[PDB]
Design a protein around this ligand. Sequence first.
Ligand SMILES: Nc1nccc(-c2ccc3c(N)n[nH]c3c2)n1
Length: 279
Amino acid sequence: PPQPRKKRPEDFKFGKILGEGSFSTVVLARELATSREYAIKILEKRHIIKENKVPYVTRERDVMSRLDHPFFVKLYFTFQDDEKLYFGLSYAKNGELLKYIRKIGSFDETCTRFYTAEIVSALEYLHGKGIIHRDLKPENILLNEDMHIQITDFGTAKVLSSFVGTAQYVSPELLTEKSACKSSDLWALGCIIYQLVAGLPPFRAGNEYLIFQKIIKLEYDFPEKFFPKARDLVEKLLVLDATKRLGCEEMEGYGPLKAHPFFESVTWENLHQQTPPKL
Ligand SMILES: Nc1nccc(-c2ccc3c(N)n[nH]c3c2)n1
């Protein structure tokens, strides 16, 4: 069927910068014809080509097109001009989950449970499509106006059937094997839960090399103020042997993960319809 004509830069009033990476900048934009706000990710073609990033840009576009779920930033449109590529993305007005962790220090058990459940539910959907994020972290987990999560940044994703993420969230197998799987995301999940509860990521040190040392030695520990059921859950995710992490295929998938006692009170079927606990 006839899709709308390609959009163009002149269709938008660009505004503030929402994020910037080494190969991209995200800018808030208001579409003139609709008054709709989008987060437009802008990439310089010459820079992408010069640095051999075409496969990453291509993978991000192809992945974000296949995703159709409330807990993921949506790709609405793409266009280009002579110098740049533009991706129209969902605007998550409340920014990064990381910001909330810093602002309030640590989450109480109700908020930890609710947001962990959304991430688990998001991962179940992503993994059921044979997609692996490979760089999951609080910086990539955005909050919409409604305070529900929206996971973004899929340039580094792998579609099942090479790259190393953000040091604090790298799984051991990436350091010893150079190979990633769904279980690498579950490892990151373990780190994120721990971070929501402790206020800090589990593996910390003065530099990348020392963080990696700690990861492969499973060198971290829990604070006394750690919800016992959350602790048990984290211990079942932060496991060196990737095939023994709660949630992976060899452990029989998402059922047993979702049935963990930490999630006892969670109703999984309609999280996105529930009202997030106030932060
Ligand atoms: N795919 C991708 N890559 C890099 C950054 C982003 C991104 C960053 C910030 C926002 C926001 N406030 N709303 N939407 C965003 C999307 N998205």
